[PDB]
Design a protein around this ligand. Sequence first.
Ligand SMILES: [Y+2]
Lengths: 94, 142
Amino acid sequence: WLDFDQLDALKPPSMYKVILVNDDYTPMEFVIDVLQKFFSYDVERATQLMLAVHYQGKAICGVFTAEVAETKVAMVNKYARENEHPLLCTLEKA
Amino acid sequence: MLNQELELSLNMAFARAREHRHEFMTVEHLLLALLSNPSAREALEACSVDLVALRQELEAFIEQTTPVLPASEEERDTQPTLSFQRVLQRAVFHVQSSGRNEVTGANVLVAIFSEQESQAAYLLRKHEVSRLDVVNFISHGT
Ligand SMILES: [Y+2]
């Protein structure tokens, strides 16, 4: 549960791409874990995305509102930190 | 010190988000909850806001953009966005910086304007409400 007190023209906020960056330390298995746990992908699709990160250097995990993207990025980076991997998750305007 | 009516708004909004299996409790879930929070509702009415339309815009956005947790996952639950956490902390900071402790729904409404990339702030400005409009209501009424 939560502890609430201790946690001209107008344009709408942009959507944001959430990206996983490649590195030489993070195991393929952990990248897949991250894709299933934080992005709800099945084993097959998570494996494809993992391969894209591996060969292309980076891959788009998903597209979310600025607000949701910011949270997902922080969650992924914290999970990588706790597991001692330098896996970098970032966001970029869609 | 979040007042009774604010806590009730916050807790019910969180419970509904959990019942809908929403992955996140957003600033938009928050603003939606504030529409029926007496303190925030009064401020919006003083700003001539069409609450029926704002409610509909918030509900549609929430349904279209909030990811839903799979029935398979039973370890992670609804959690607040960073933006949501910042708004509540900002409301408490604002009130304490004036020398007081009671945080109302109207103070939370004021805090929402500082999340410039939130849909809630965009919608408030679309309904011609500025942060100063709310602060003036809190200070002077009308
Ligand atoms: Y507490």
